[PDB]
Each structure stands twice: as structure tokens, then as C-alpha cells.
Amino acid sequence: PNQVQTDIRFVEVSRSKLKQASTSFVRRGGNLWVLGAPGSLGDIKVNADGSGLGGTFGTGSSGFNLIFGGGKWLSFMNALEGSGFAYTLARPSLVAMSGQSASFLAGGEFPYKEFGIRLTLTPTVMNNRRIALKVAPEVSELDYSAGIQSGGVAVPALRVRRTDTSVMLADGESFVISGLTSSNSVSNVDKFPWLGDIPILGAFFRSTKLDKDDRELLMIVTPHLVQPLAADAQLPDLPTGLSD
Amino acid sequence: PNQVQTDIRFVEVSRSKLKQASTSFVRRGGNLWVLGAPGSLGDIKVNADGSGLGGTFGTGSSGFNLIFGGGKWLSFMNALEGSGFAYTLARPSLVAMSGQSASFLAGGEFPYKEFGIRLTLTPTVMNNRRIALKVAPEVSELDYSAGIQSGGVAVPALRVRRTDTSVMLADGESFVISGLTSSNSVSNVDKFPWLGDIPILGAFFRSTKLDKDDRELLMIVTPHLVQPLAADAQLPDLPTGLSD
Amino acid sequence: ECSQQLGQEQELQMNMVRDMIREGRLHAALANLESMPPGLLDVREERALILRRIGDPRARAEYQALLETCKAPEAHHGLGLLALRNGDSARAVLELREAARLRPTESRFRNDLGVALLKRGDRVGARFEFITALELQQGGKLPATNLLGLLYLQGDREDAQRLIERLQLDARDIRAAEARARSWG
Amino acid sequence: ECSQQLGQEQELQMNMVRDMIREGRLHAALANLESMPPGLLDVREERALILRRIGDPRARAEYQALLETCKAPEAHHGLGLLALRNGDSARAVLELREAARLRPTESRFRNDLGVALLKRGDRVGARFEFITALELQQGGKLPATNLLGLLYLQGDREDAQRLIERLQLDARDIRAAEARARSWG
Amino acid sequence: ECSQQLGQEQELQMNMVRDMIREGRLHAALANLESMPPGLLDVREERALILRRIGDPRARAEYQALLETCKAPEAHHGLGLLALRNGDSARAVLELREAARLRPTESRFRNDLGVALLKRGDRVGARFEFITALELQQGGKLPATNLLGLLYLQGDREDAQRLIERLQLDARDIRAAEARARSWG
């Protein structure tokens, strides 16, 4: 045979976690007290004569917001502990004659730039029956952010995972042409200088943020020498003697 | 015969699922309580004196919205579990003389860029009666998003599935020149730190999102050697002896 | 008409059922139909088809039940073919006439009714029905020799040869033509 | 006029019916019409046409019913052709005259009425009707020899030869011309 | 139907379980299932499969419990295969018939039920079930020789040779075919 079917196998697994916490409160009556956590009190200005606040409190968007009005007392709390999981699998296949380039697309085009499953390759069958592959897989998807003033408007970003390399394999052999393991951690703690270290009540004088991420990738290639289905063949389609 | 009729057979099946859930509530009378799920309470600001809220609640667009006003109590709930199914089939055919290029279009043009069923090919019949095909099928359709400031306005995107390759077959033989299997899963859970883990009531302190997708593709080519219909032939048109 | 349509989940399944039917996998098609809901007129008639072809005894009842539904024509035709299998051409001709009436364009129904008439002796009516079937089909394969053998039984050898020329029949089919001509009668 | 139009679902079907009619598949056309709604004037007249050509006994009644509808001209013409088939030229001429009157431009009606007159003996009227038919048709095939044979019956051999030259008739048609000239009378 | 789905955390795990099952690591698959929650129908049936194949005594109870759940077909099939292992073909045929009924398209169920019938003596029913299994599978490997050996037991040597040609069987499979033909009976 002089024609090659190339099977690609792509897998990505990613996990993430997120935590945050902050607290603020106000008191009234004769006296007046306020404790605004970092970035919480920016919405409000107090009048010249100190008789009371002159603004409206806001809310943190990203996390659960709890409020409590208790007459004189007024308090706000933002908290969150969340996790995410993502999984992706793609097994594109493509046939091409020896020495001939081939291309495949399974995504789309936005105002034009392509995305989605892409695959360009060029198999060469050598005199020793080994297969030399020039291969360039891609797996991309839309990510919504940013903007532009030319050639588009409010165009989204792309989350892209691609590889490009050249290898040699025998019929049926396989390679992990690419792989990745990644991990990221970011933390931050803000506290009132003295009160933040109280062993129990200190938590109410602290603000916190935590972001963690992990990821793993695999791209596997497998070339096969193939022949056309016979003229009488039924085409592939989509919707003791015991078995032991 | 020196003329080739090429039959293309394209099939795509895709499935999707979607789930989400969130809850929020408010209470009044002497005391005041609020619990806003992530992204739910951004519409509202509370006044300086803490006598009451100063904004109007909104609704999540994507899912079923249920509300309950019960005097002091006020609650909102967004939920959805939905699924989708899509199927596509295309069987374009095209005739061309040996060594001559041919093209076919069955979609349209928007302000100009083409879309819809497309097919460009170039069959060569070799001295051994085998057929060498240079073929580049496409199946595309409009997808509505994004915008542009030049050469168009609010132009939509394209959902594109195309292939390009070169192969050799005998009269009547077939190839699966391209194929794909894909799967994507995305999940996210947000919870109030301590209350979210209550075995029963914790569900009301959690927000969730799930997106899953699956897909399968096939592109099949089949060349036939043909001859013209006879001068007296009736043209094709569109609207024991027993059969056993 | 048939005012019943199935979803892309259970109709994409009837496609596979049909594939099995024409693949020679009648029994696997029966399995897959059994997977599908019983009482579905389409599934009911497909099951009856399989049962009659494979020799099951329930095809009779399946056709019987479907007589009183939108699947009337094929139920009548099924009962007719059952009568033919039993050799009782008397009621077979009647049921085949009814079926060919209710859905006329069905080449299969016309070619079966013509054979039933030929067996029953209505040679002019058999010629009518065979010609209808042969005209419906794009040149015919069974219909063409169904009229050729009728002509042979009628002795019009030169008219039969006229049809040999027109249809462009081959000796590979002439042998079967004489065989079926002997069969008739 | 005919104030009845059928939808692109059941008129795309009458197109196929006509295709069958002119294909020689009259009986298959009858089948497909039977599929279509009975009582439809178009389907009724098409069925009557098929029935009369194939020899069915119901064409008479079909034409009869359609006489009292917008399908009047062709119903009269059908009854006339029935009378001709029976050989009763007397009423055939009357009905053909009525049909040719109500829808004059129909070349078929004129050429049939001329033959009916020629059989009945109104040679001058037969010449009138044959000339009308031959003028309507773009040169004529049946009309031309329908007037040639009338001339032959009338003995104007040189006028007939004038028409041979003008029409550019061929001996392949001269043989049929003499045959039909013998037929008339 | 089965109205129970597991999350991408504990279903990505069932994928590994299946990998172990088909790797020959049944026991490691059992370990990983034991890690997963007991009472999960999927995990329960997978564990029962492993237990039956490895010879554990609890597979019987696992199948028994799953009979009253959405995992009914495979529970019936498991109990049937247990009966076959014990040699009690009597109830094995009954349970295999039930399983093949409830989920017909399962080639494995059909090929097991055919063997059970062949052992029990219902040769015509065994042929039915073997043909169903052989048609379901894309050409068959066990089904093909399951019908070949049935034919050998029935003595139709030339029909068996017909299947040798059609299936394109090889002597490497003919030896096993005669061996299993001896096994049956």
C-alpha cells in the first residue's frame, strides 16, 4: 500500500480552585464606627460635618454576598470556595497518498480566523516501509475577552493547544509527540496590623485570596497503511463456544 | 470511459447537555438578611443608613427563573437541565472529464464570502483504470456572533467542516478520507465555605454549572466511471415470481 | 395518511432497522425493533414483515392489527402474501386487489396481485396488473419476466420475442422465464 | 373557465401523472391518480382518458359526469370518441361538433371531428374541419394525411400532389395515406 | 432505561475500570471498583462481571440484586451464564431467552442463548439465535463458527462449505469449528 491513514489522539485535563473572604461593618448612634476591607469602602464618601455617610454600599461580584442590617449595626461579608474541572478529547483521522499534503478542519471561522479541531499533515512512505510524518495538530476554542477596532469588533480570544514536529514511525507504531504537566499557585493575605493576629477574632480583620490551577496534556500520533474499501463493501455508517 | 462521477457522503452527529442551579433570598422586618449567589446581587446597592435596599433585582437569562414573594421573605431560583441533538447529511455528486477541474456550490454568499455545500475536485483516470482524486469537500453554515467595521456589518460567523486530500481508488471503491470523534466536559461548583457542606441544606448554598458536548464525523468518497445518457433516454427527474 | 412521526433519536434507529432488513439481517432488525417501543405503527409493520419472511406465526396477527390503522395497505398485502404462502389463492387475490387499490403506485403490490390473478385464472386482469407493475418499475426485473411468462402461457411467442427485443432480455433471464412459466398454472 | 387550482404538493403529482400518460404507462398513471383525491376535475378527466384508451367500461360515466363541469369540452369529446369506437358515427359527429365548438383551438378535437364528418358523409364540412386541424398544428402529421386521403377519396389527384409538394410528404406517409383513404368510406 | 449518570470525577474512573476489564486485569478492576462507591448500579454490574469470570461466589448475589434495577438484562444474562457454568442448561436457556428478549441487539446475549439452545436441543431455535448473533456482529468470529458447528452437527456439509466460502473461514478456524462441534451434544 502507498496510502496512509493517520490517527491523532489528544487529551487534556485541568483542575482549578478558588478561595476568598472579606468582612466589613458599620455602626451608628451617638458614636460612629466603620471598618472597610481592602477595596470595599471606595463607594462611599462622608460629609463635612461628620453626621453620617453619604454613599451607597456595593457588593463584590465574584463570590457569595451576605448582608445583615440590625438597626445600628450593619455588616457585609464576601466569601467563596469553588473548584472547576475540564476535560477534552479529540480523535481526528485523515487519509492521504504518500508524498501528498492533506488538511482537515472541524471548527469554524469568526470575523476570518479559524479555530476548532485542525490538522495538517504530509505522510511519506519510505522504501523500508517506515512512515515519515510531518504533522501539525491543533485544538482551539473561543475565549471571551478583549476588543478590537479594525478587522472586527469585540472579537473574542482563543484558548489554543497546538503542536508541530516531524517524526518517523513504522506501520502501527505510536509516539507521544508532545506532553505537558503544569501547576500554578497564587496567594495573598491582607490584615489589620495589630488586630489581624488575634488567634480567634483576627479572622474578621483579614482578607484572603487563593488561586490554584493544574493541567495535563497528551498528543499521540499513529499511522496505518490502508487500502480502499472493495467495490462490494458495505460502507461504514453512524446511527465451549460461549462468549466467556 | 474517460469521464468520472464522484459521489461524496458526509454525516455529522452531535449531542450536548447543560445544567445549572443557583438560589438567592432576602428577608425584612426589624432585621435584614441577604444571600446573593455569585453574580446575582450585582444589580443592587444598599443605602448609607441601612434602612433597606436601593436597587431592583434582575433575572438570569439562560434558565428557568422562579420567584416567590411572601411578604417579609423574597427568594429567587435559577435552574436548567437541557439537552440538544443535531444531525446533518449531504450527498453531493459531480461529473467531470479526466484531467479537468470541476466545482460545485449549493449554499450562498453574504456581504462576498461563500458558505454551504461546496465541492472542488479533479479526477484523473490512469492507464491502469484506477482513479486518482484531488478532492476538497466543505459543509458550512451561518453562526451568529461577533461584528466587523470594514467590508461588512454585524457579519455572522461560520460553522465549518472541510477536508482536502489526494487519494487513489479503483472504479467503485470507497474511502473514509476523514473522520472525527470528540468530547468536551466543563464543570464548576461554587459554595458558601461552611454551609455548603451541610448534607441536605447545603444545596441551597451552592451554585453549579455543567457543559458537555460530543461529536462524530464521516466523509466518504466514491468515484464511478460513467457514460452519457443515450439520445433516446428518458431523463432523470424529481417529483414463484412473487416479490418475496 | 399517517399522522405519526418519530424523533431523530428513535427514527435514526428505524434507519438502522431498514439497513438490517435489506442486509439480510431480518432477525437482527427484529431484535432492534424489539428494542424500540411496541405499538409504534412503523415498528409494528416492520416486525410483521420480518415475521412473515422468516416464517414466524405472529406475522398474521401483526398484519391483522395493522389493518385498522394508517398501516392498512401493507397489512392487507401481508395477509394476501400469507394466503399465497398457504396456497389459498382465492382470498389472496381479493386481499391483493384491496391493497393494490388503496395504495396503487406500489410496484410490489401490483406485481404480487398480477401473480395472484395469473394463478387464479383472470389472465386479462393478470395482464393488466403485470403491465401496471412493469410500467411503475424503471424497466422492471420481476415484472418483465412476469409478463413474459404470462405471454408464454398464452402462446404468443412472437409477442414474447418482441418483449425480448424491447426489454433487451438475456438468456440468463430466459431460463428463469421458462421456469416461472412452468410454475404458473 | 376552470376555477380550481391544486397545490404544489398535489400538482407536482399531476405532472408525474402526465409523464406516465405520455410514457405509455396509462395504467400506472391510473394508479397514481387513484392515489390522488377522487372528485378532482383534473384527476377525473385524466382517469377518464386512461379508462377510454385502455378499454375500461367506466370511461363513459367519467365523461358523463364531467359534462356538467368546467371539464365540459373534453367530456363531450370523450363521449364522441366512445361513439366512434362503437361505430355509431351519428351521435359521434354531433358530440364532436359540440366539443370543437366549445374549445375550438384544440387541434385534436378538430382532426377528430373532421374524421367523423368524413365517415358521416359531410365531405365539405369534413374538409373544413380537417383544414382547421391542419392549420392549427405546425404543419400537421395526422391532419395532413387526413386531408390528403379526403382528396384521394374525392379524386383530385393533382391537388393531392400539390399537397405532397407543399407539405413535403414522403412515400412512408403516402402508403399510410392510401391505407386511410381506403379506410374512409 | 437507566436514569443514573456519574460525574466526570467518578466516570473518568469507570473508564479506567473498563480498561482494566479488557486488559485482563479483572482483579485490579475489582480493586478500583471497590474504591468507587458500592451500590452504584454500574459499579455493581461491573463487579458482578469480574466476580463471575474470576470464580468468586458473590457474582450470583450481585446479579440477583441487579435483576430488580435498570441493570436487568445483564443480571439475567449473568445468572444464565452461572447456570451454564454449573451445567444446568435447563434454567440457563430460560434466563438467556429472557435476557435476549429484554435487550435484543446484544450480540453477546444472542450468541450465548444460541449455544444454550443448541445444548438444550432446540436446534431450530438455536439456529435462529446463532443467525441473529452472526448478523449483529460485523461478520462474526464466535457466531460464525457457532453456526458452522451447528451445521456440522446437522450434517449439511455442503451448506457448511457454502459458509466457509462466504465467511472466508480459514483452517485455523476449521479446527476449532470441528472441536466445538464435538463439544456440542
Automatic annotation (TrEMBL), chains A, B:
<dbReference type="GO" id="GO:0009306">
    <property type="term" value="P:protein secretion"/>
</dbReference>
<dbReference type="GO" id="GO:0015627">
    <property type="term" value="C:type II protein secretion system complex"/>
</dbReference>
<feature type="domain" description="Type II/III secretion system secretin-like">
    <location>
        <begin position="79"/>
        <end position="226"/>
    </location>
</feature>
<protein>
    <submittedName>
        <fullName>RcpA</fullName>
    </submittedName>
</protein>
<comment type="similarity">
    <text>Belongs to the bacterial secretin family.</text>
</comment>
